[PDB]
Amino acid sequence: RVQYLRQIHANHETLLREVQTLRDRLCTEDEASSCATAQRLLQVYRQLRHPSLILL
Amino acid sequence: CWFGVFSGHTLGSVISTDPLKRFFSHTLTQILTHSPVLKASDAVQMQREWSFARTHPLLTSLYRRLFVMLSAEELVGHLQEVLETQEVHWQRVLSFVSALVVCFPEAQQLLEDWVARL
Amino acid sequence: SLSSAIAKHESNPYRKELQREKKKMLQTNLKVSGALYREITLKVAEVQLKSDFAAQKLSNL
């Protein structure tokens, strides 16, 4: 169908732009490279890994 | 070109039709609501000039398009709702009903229904 | 790129006559090639491998 594929695309692009802003803040030494960065990315990792690659 | 992109062959293909419908509903209300001039209740003889073929083909095309990407009784309820709620531009509403009656599959009796209620 | 390749496989009385023609154009048609899905899910799988490998260095440390 279409609804489900667009659900997935939008769910991904929100994360992607969020990650991208996060990458630039790491370029400008804005935020930190202590941590909570690391702990943020290990939250994105877990979000995605639950239904990784439904194969049809 | 604006009405061209509005024709929802390119757009319907990419966009889920929950927010697209909200866009069209706000668009329709914004066509009707904005600049409520010629409120003259004596806007009677001007019905002849707001006849479907005299109303511009651009209006006609966009109205057909708005009918295509939406449903009929949704449109009827929405019209009933807005005309009850908020003031009008009589040009666009009269043109709009003129396009409604001939475009949609026999909703002149669905018109008579809420006409009788009103 | 999965969803973009798919959203390119998805594109490809007189008033009533033309209303019906445009209804026929917008009739709910879905053409999501299974083989394309497959192609892209392997490209994706290659990267999931890379992201998963990279999460072990991070969640270990």
Curated annotation (Swiss-Prot), chain A:
Superkingdom in the source lineage: Eukaryota
Annotated localization: Nucleus
Self-association state and partner proteins as the record states: Belongs to the multisubunit FA complex composed of FANCA, FANCB, FANCC, FANCE, FANCF, FANCG, FANCL/PHF9, FANCM, FAAP24 and FAAP100. Forms a subcomplex with FANCB and FANCL.
Summary of the function given for this chain in its UniProt record: Plays a role in Fanconi anemia-associated DNA damage response network. Regulates FANCD2 monoubiquitination and the stability of the FA core complex. Induces chromosomal instability as well as hypersensitivity to DNA cross-linking agents, when repressed.
Protein name: Fanconi anemia core complex-associated protein 100
Native organism: Homo sapiens (Human)
Gene from which this protein is expressed: FAAP100
Span within the parent record: 826 to 881 of 881
Swiss-Prot record, chain B:
Annotated disorder: Fanconi anemia, complementation group A: A disorder affecting all bone marrow elements and resulting in anemia, leukopenia and thrombopenia. It is associated with cardiac, renal and limb malformations, dermal pigmentary changes, and a predisposition to the development of malignancies. At the cellular level it is associated with hypersensitivity to DNA-damaging agents, chromosomal instability (increased chromosome breakage) and defective DNA repair.
Portion of the full sequence shown: 297 to 414 of 1455
Segments traversing the membrane: none
Post-translational modifications: Phosphorylation is required for the formation of the nuclear complex. Not phosphorylated in cells derived from groups A, B, C, E, F, G, and H.
Cysteine-cysteine disulfides: none
Natural source organism: Homo sapiens
Localization annotation: Nucleus; Cytoplasm
Function: DNA repair protein that may operate in a postreplication repair or a cell cycle checkpoint function. May be involved in interstrand DNA cross-link repair and in the maintenance of normal chromosome stability.
Assembly mode: Belongs to the multisubunit FA complex composed of FANCA, FANCB, FANCC, FANCE, FANCF, FANCG, FANCL/PHF9 and FANCM. The complex is not found in FA patients. In complex with FANCF, FANCG and FANCL, but not with FANCC, nor FANCE, interacts with HES1; this interaction may be essential for the stability and nuclear localization of FA core complex proteins. The complex with FANCC and FANCG may also include EIF2AK2 and HSP70. Interacts with FAAP20/C1orf86; interaction is direct.
Protein name (database record): Fanconi anemia group A protein
Curated annotation (Swiss-Prot), chain C:
Compartments (UniProt record): Nucleus
Assembly description: Belongs to the multisubunit FA complex composed of FANCA, FANCB, FANCC, FANCE, FANCF, FANCG, FANCL/PHF9 and FANCM. The complex is not found in FA patients.
Purpose of the protein: DNA repair protein required for FANCD2 ubiquitination.
Disease: Fanconi anemia complementation group B: A disorder affecting all bone marrow elements and resulting in anemia, leukopenia and thrombopenia. It is associated with cardiac, renal and limb malformations, dermal pigmentary changes, and a predisposition to the development of malignancies. At the cellular level it is associated with hypersensitivity to DNA-damaging agents, chromosomal instability (increased chromosome breakage) and defective DNA repair. Some severe FANCB cases manifest features of VACTERL syndrome with hydrocephalus.
Name of this chain's protein: Fanconi anemia group B protein
Name of the gene this protein is made from: FANCB
